[PDB]
């Protein structure tokens, strides 16, 4: 909120960030260590979307540099499909069966029609819900706000905008409204959302713009699917988030400057709102006493494998979902023999890791 | 003795020498059973089951 020039100066900390990335915190580190002393007028959550390929990644990383706000690049399947020790697990789709074979975003705009698609639309789901925990950890944690691309929120419009065009089947969206009804009431909404509104015709040209080898020879970015999104962030996303969160609207901020929206946003005022204390406006956010504080940060701090839990809901009447039991085995052995993925990563050996007799650490938040 | 004293039959007399393995079975028991307990964690971590050997020394 306030920029640089604001403040004159470089963020100042009111207390010493809680290293959230290695020390845990629960119930018992919340009696020495107290969370409402990090907030500043910054402590607040950005979400900075809007329609495909709008320059959204070039404008949020000049923005959270402005205000001093932690920015974090939009989610990829390269987070499943690459391991920590950064070898590549597609390299092993020639051993899987076909049904588990590898499936990214070159593969839904090429065969967008391939059965793979249901499943790819619930893991971006999944990775944004991760992700967007993980800067609520930074914002509890550290005070400093974080600037998202793409929140879980705004997930769904692009789940309905296949499903319109006959991607995917009743099955599939009927299995990806429970998960999102099963988890999405977890989460704290954002302060703030920032739109992008590029017209359907500018996108259209400005994907060209890339020359993203696939891209441009796929056939998905019709007009139809492109003007599905829009009808689909304006009338049920934007329309929904605004009740909580401020909302700002521009042509394209990617083509225009950010300066001139940094010093927009310091403009919209924050606390004209906290008075009123049943006020829907950042509803989540409102915490009236120190307990608060830290039941939501002990949830995402602590809770989060709870939060990762909860997307388990068995749905197999769904026949593309499900993954034969043939299958399975045959996946199991290929996917957890392949380098880096025998043990938790860290320990294993054959990939470089050493000292693991004397070695007992594991991560915290961290898998296995 | 052709005698059924019962307090004959409790008390004791030293004859009988208690097997090897008595002295010795509880211990070596629970250190067995308290190293494959440290192995399971490594396991349900998908650790290497002796990486960390501090844990299955305690
Ligand atoms: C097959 C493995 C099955 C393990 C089942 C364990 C049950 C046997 C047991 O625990 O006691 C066996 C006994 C050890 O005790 P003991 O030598 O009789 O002397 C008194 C001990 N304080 O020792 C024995 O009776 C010897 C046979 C069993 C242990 C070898
Ligand atoms: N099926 C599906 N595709 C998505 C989703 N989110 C993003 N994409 C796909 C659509 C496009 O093929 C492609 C567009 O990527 P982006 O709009 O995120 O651009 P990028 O973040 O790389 O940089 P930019 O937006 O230009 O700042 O990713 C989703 O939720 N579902």
């Given at each position: 909120?306030?920029?640089?020039?604001?403040?004159?100066?470089?963020?100042?900390?009111?207390?010493?960030?809680?290293?959230?990335?290695?020390?845990?915190?629960?119930?018992?580190?919340?009696?020495?260590?107290?969370?409402?002393?990090?907030?500043?007028?910054?402590?607040?959550?950005?979400?900075?979307?809007?329609?495909?390929?709008?320059?959204?990644?070039?404008?949020?990383?000049?923005?959270?540099?402005?205000?001093?706000?932690?920015?974090?690049?939009?989610?990829?399947?390269?987070?499943?499909?690459?391991?920590?020790?950064?070898?590549?697990?597609?390299?092993?789709?020639?051993?899987?069966?076909?049904?588990?074979?590898?499936?990214?975003?070159?593969?839904?705009?090429?065969?967008?029609?391939?059965?793979?698609?249901?499943?790819?639309?619930?893991?971006?789901?999944?990775?944004?819900?991760?992700?967007?925990?993980?800067?609520?950890?930074?914002?509890?944690?550290?005070?400093?706000?974080?600037?998202?691309?793409?929140?879980?929120?705004?997930?769904?419009?692009?789940?309905?905008?296949?499903?319109?065009?006959?991607?995917?089947?009743?099955?599939?969206?009927?299995?990806?409204?429970?998960?999102?009804?099963?988890?999405?009431?977890?989460?704290?909404?954002?302060?703030?959302?920032?739109?992008?509104?590029?017209?359907?015709?500018?996108?259209?040209?400005?994907?060209?713009?890339?020359?993203?080898?696939?891209?441009?020879?796929?056939?998905?970015?019709?007009?139809?699917?492109?003007?599905?999104?829009?009808?689909?962030?304006?009338?049920?996303?934007?329309?929904?988030?605004?009740?909580?969160?401020?909302?700002?609207?521009?042509?394209?901020?990617?083509?225009?400057?950010?300066?001139?929206?940094?010093?927009?946003?310091?403009?919209?005022?924050?606390?004209?709102?906290?008075?009123?204390?049943?006020?829907?406006?950042?509803?989540?956010?409102?915490?009236?006493?120190?307990?608060?504080?830290?039941?939501?940060?002990?949830?995402?701090?602590?809770?989060?494998?709870?939060?990762?839990?909860?997307?388990?809901?068995?749905?197999?009447?769904?026949?593309?979902?499900?993954?034969?039991?043939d299958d399975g085995k045959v996946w199991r052995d290929v996917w957890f023999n392949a380098p880096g993925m025998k043990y938790?990563?860290?320990?294993?050996?054959?990939?470089?890791?050493?000292?693991?007799?004397?070695?007992?650490?594991?991560?915290?938040?961290?898998?296995? | 003795?052709?005698?059924?004293?019962?307090?004959?039959?409790?008390?004791?007399?030293?004859?009988?020498?208690?097997?090897?393995?008595?002295?010795?079975?509880?211990?070596?028991?629970?250190?067995?059973?308290?190293?494959?307990?440290?192995?399971?964690?490594?396991?349900?971590?998908?650790?290497?089951?002796?990486?960390?050997?501090?844990?299955?020394?305690?």
């Open positions: 909120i306030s920029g640089k020039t604001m403040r004159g100066g470089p963020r100042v900390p009111k207390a010493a960030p809680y290293p959230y990335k290695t020390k845990k915190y629960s119930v018992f580190n919340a009696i020495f260590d107290k969370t409402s002393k990090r907030f500043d007028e910054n402590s607040k959550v950005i979400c900075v979307e809007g329609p495909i390929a709008a320059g959204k990644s070039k404008f949020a990383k000049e923005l959270a540099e402005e205000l001093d706000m932690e920015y974090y690049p939009a989610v990829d399947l390269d987070l499943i499909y690459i391991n920590s020790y950064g070898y590549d697990m597609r390299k092993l789709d020639p051993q899987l069966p076909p049904s588990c074979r590898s499936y990214d975003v070159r593969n839904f705009c090429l065969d967008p029609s391939h059965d793979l698609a249901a499943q790819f639309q619930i893991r971006m789901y999944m990775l944004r819900y991760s992700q967007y925990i993980d800067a609520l950890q930074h914002v509890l944690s550290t005070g400093q706000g974080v600037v998202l691309e793409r929140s879980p929120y705004s997930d769904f419009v692009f789940m309905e905008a296949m499903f319109r065009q006959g991607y995917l089947s009743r099955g599939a969206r009927s299995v990806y409204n429970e998960l999102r009804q099963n988890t999405i009431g977890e989460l704290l909404k954002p302060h703030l959302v920032i739109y992008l509104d590029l017209p359907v015709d500018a996108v259209k040209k400005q994907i060209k713009a890339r020359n993203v080898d696939y891209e441009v020879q796929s056939k998905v970015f019709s007009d139809a699917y492109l003007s599905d999104l829009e009808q689909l962030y304006k009338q049920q996303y934007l329309k929904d988030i605004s009740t909580h969160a401020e909302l700002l609207i521009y042509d394209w901020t990617a083509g225009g400057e950010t300066e001139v929206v940094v010093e927009d946003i310091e403009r919209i005022d924050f606390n004209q709102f906290e008075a009123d204390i049943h006020n829907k406006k950042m509803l989540d956010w409102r915490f009236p006493l120190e307990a608060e504080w830290c039941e939501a940060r002990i949830k995402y701090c602590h809770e989060k494998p709870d939060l990762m839990n909860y997307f388990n809901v068995p749905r197999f009447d769904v026949p593309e979902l499900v993954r034969s039991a938790r990563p860290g320990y294993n050996a054959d990939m470089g890791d050493e000292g693991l007799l004397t070695k007992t650490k594991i991560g915290i938040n961290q898998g296995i | 003795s052709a005698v059924n004293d019962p307090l004959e039959l409790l008390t004791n007399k030293g004859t009988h020498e208690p097997s090897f393995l008595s002295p010795i079975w509880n211990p070596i028991a629970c250190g067995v059973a308290g190293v494959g307990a440290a192995i399971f964690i490594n396991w349900g971590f998908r650790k290497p089951v002796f990486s960390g050997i501090q844990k299955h020394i305690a």
